[PDB]
Design a protein around this ligand. Structure first.
Ligand SMILES: O=C(COc1ccccc1)Nc1ccccc1O
Lengths: 172, 171
């Protein structure tokens, strides 16, 4: 995936979030610190927070990331699209895990009720563990794919099954 | 403790530490002018070559941090392997590959002997985090069997469409 998409992935709470533009940051609701009253040096009162289940969007009154261009955010992707999940791991290692996307789904994953776009990892037979699959610390990592001449972001990492084969992306 | 630490830049591609003393790679990526590898004189290294598969056995522990892994001569047909690709970008690309028969295959005009495979990404490039490139040669083919990881060969060749790959195997 291009260097400018990796530059948008920010360590945040117990996982990650993604800069769509200089003023828009998206993440998974459950990684947000529940006591937090300030983000990137800005008070809550100067932020527009839009939460739909496990999808949260922050819109800032000022340009936090002026090095960035605004890119397209869509509400999931067509069934069958192959996406990359942009996962950062220990010591500047970059893991763009390939996932074939499926239908909008509701699941029970480790007792928790999760809703979003389901997908199947294309990394191995069974992706149990950190070498071929996701870990809980990956929540908030973006789902991206390339169209003709450009890249789209279509959601953020919310959950994975105990086998590791099935993932859920939270969508706007 | 990670499989990824075993994948090492080597020659014109990569190789893989099976154990503290055993390193496998693709024959064509190996330097043809050398007096040492990983600081050990070639004097003290056993080299076993079979077609596009090469195994190095060192006389001392180069990677004492590692346990020994199972190395086998390919895998059953229908096994879904992962090819553990490292890129000079810093990206790690594990790609699912459905494995087929051992054969001599014509790959972009040359004959390559090894185990055929097809990527589960299938479609195309369009963000080459979905297929292989020439600099990937020597990347290992692994799969999980019960509690155990198995390595069953090294990346030797791929077709232009990138659907078909060849895993060079021991013996
Ligand atoms: O403003 C920031 C970082 O935090 C600060 C620093 C100084 C004063 C106020 C806030 N930008 C930034 C850079 C890289 C990634 C995400 C970011 O928000």
């Amino acid at each position: 995936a291009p260097p400018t998409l990796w530059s948008r992935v920010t360590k945040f709470g117990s996982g990650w979030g993604f800069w769509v533009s200089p003023t828009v940051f998206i993440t998974t609701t459950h990684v947000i610190p529940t006591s937090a009253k300030e983000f990137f040096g800005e008070p809550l009162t100067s932020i527009a927070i839009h939460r739909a289940g496990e999808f949260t969007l922050f819109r800032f009154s000022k340009k936090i990331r002026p090095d960035l261009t605004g890119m397209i955010l869509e509400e999931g992707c067509p069934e069958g699209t192959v996406c990359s999940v942009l996962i950062k791991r220990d010591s500047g290692e970059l893991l763009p895990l390939a996932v074939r996307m499926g239908a909008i789904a509701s699941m029970r994953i480790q007792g928790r009720l999760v809703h979003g776009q389901s997908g199947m990892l294309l990394t191995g037979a069974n992706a149990k563990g950190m070498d071929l699959g996701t870990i809980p610390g990956d929540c908030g990592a973006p789902y991206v794919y390339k169209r003709a001449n450009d890249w789209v972001v279509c959601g953020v990492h919310a959950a994975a099954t105990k086998s590791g084969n099935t993932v859920v992306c939270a969508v706007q």
